Amino acid sequence: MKQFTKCELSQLLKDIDGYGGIALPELICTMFHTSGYDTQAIVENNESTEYGLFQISNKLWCKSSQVPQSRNICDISCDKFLDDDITDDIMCAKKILDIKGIDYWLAHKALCTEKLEQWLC
Ligand SMILES: [Ca+2]
């Protein structure tokens, strides 16, 4: 259920290259192994769930019925991360990068800090 090509995502996110010292291919890499470019991706964990192209968690970042105690850092309902517009998802991902850095994503150190030429367009 890929909803983007690696190339279209690289073009849409072109100005996020360098953001907090992030290389763009590093990020695209991270997004692919995270969500498979599926804007509707839902990953269910123990106490919580991660949503969308960026797999943003309801534990901290958005408001959801599942975690009423969430601080909702991005000030947004998690449902917004399952629509076809990734603009709000990108806003939140940047807030994550501003705080916690690219290591929020467990795919980044696992696969995206080494051998990245396949993520170029
Ligand atoms: Ca969205």
Curated annotation (Swiss-Prot):
Binding residues for Ca(2+) 1: 39-40, 82, 84
Annotated ranges, domain C-type lysozyme: 2-121
Organism superkingdom: Eukaryota
GO cellular component, one term: protein-containing complex
Keywords from the named record: Calcium, Disulfide bond, Glycoprotein, Lactose biosynthesis, Metal-binding, Milk protein, Secreted, Signal, Zinc
Glycosylation sites: 46, 72
Gene Ontology biological process terms, A to Z: apoptotic process; cell-cell signaling; defense response to bacterium; defense response to Gram-negative bacterium; defense response to Gram-positive bacterium; lactose biosynthetic process; signal transduction
Residues that, per the record, bind Ca(2+) 2: 80, 83, 85, 88-89
Cystine residue pairs: 7-121, 29-112, 62-78, 74-92
Keyword Glycoprotein: yes
Tissue: Mammary gland specific. Secreted in milk.
GO molecular function: calcium ion binding; lactose synthase activity; lysozyme activity
Binding site for Zn(2+): 50, 117
Places the protein is found: Secreted
Subunit annotation: Lactose synthase (LS) is a heterodimer of a catalytic component, beta1,4-galactosyltransferase (beta4Gal-T1) and a regulatory component, alpha-lactalbumin (LA).
Record family assignment: Belongs to the glycosyl hydrolase 22 family.
Role, per record: Regulatory subunit of lactose synthase, changes the substrate specificity of galactosyltransferase in the mammary gland making glucose a good acceptor substrate for this enzyme. This enables LS to synthesize lactose, the major carbohydrate component of milk. In other tissues, galactosyltransferase transfers galactose onto the N-acetylglucosamine of the oligosaccharide chains in glycoproteins.
Name of the protein in question: Alpha-lactalbumin
Species of provenance: Homo sapiens (Human)
Residues of the full protein shown: 20 to 139 of 142
